[PDB]
N, CA, C and O atoms as a GROMACS GRO file, in nm:
protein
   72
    1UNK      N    1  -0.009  -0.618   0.973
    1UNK     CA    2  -0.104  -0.719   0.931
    1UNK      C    3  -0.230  -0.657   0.874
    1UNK      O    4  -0.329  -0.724   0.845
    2UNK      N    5  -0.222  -0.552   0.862
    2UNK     CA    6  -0.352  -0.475   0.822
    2UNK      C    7  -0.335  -0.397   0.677
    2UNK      O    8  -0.298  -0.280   0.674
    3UNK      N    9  -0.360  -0.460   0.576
    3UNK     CA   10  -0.311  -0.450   0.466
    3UNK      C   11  -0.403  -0.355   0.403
    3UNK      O   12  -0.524  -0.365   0.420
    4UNK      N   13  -0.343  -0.249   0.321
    4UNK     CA   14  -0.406  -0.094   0.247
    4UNK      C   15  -0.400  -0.106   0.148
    4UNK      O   16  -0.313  -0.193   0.139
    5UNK      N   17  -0.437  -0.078   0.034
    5UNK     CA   18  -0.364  -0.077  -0.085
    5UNK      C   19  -0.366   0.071  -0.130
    5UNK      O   20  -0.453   0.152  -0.096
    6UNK      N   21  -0.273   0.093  -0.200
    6UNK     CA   22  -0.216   0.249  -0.202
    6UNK      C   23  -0.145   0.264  -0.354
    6UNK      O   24  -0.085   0.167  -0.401
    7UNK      N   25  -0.151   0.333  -0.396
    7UNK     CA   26  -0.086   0.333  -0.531
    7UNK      C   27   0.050   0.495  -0.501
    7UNK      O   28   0.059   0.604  -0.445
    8UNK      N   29   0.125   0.401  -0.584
    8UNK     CA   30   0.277   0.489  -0.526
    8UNK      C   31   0.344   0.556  -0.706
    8UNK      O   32   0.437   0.505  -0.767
    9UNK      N   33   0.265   0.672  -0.750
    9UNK     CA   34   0.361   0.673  -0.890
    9UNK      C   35   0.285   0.650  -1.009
    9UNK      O   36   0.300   0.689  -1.125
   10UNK      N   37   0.187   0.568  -0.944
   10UNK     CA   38   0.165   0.505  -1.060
   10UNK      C   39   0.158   0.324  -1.056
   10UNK      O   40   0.087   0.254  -1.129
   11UNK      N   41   0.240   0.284  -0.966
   11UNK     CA   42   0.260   0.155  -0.912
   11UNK      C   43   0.111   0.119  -0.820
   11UNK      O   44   0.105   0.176  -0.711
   12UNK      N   45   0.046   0.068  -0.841
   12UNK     CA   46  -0.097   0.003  -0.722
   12UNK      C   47   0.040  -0.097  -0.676
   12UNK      O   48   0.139  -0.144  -0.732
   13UNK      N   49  -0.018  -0.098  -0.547
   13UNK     CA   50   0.055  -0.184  -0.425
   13UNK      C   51   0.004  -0.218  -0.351
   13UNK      O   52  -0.087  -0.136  -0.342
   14UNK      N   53  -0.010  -0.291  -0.276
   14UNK     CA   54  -0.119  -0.311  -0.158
   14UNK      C   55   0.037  -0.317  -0.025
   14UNK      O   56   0.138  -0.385  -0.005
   15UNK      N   57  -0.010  -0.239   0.015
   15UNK     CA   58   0.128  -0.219   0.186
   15UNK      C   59   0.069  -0.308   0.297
   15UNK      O   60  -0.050  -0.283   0.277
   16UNK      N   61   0.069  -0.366   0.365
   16UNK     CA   62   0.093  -0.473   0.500
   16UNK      C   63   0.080  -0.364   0.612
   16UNK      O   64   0.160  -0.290   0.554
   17UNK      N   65   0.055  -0.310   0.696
   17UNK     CA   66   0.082  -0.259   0.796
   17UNK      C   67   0.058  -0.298   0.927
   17UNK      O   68  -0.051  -0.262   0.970
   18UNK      N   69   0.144  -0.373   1.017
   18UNK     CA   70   0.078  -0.485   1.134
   18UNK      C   71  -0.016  -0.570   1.094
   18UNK      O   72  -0.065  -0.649   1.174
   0.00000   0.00000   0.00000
């Protein structure tokens, strides 16, 4: 539930984590 955002590649993503 604790959301990061992280870029993977080249891809921005935002990940969820608990």
């Amino acid at each position: 539930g604790d959301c990061r955002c992280l870029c993977r590649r080249g891809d921005c993503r935002c990940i969820c984590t608990r």
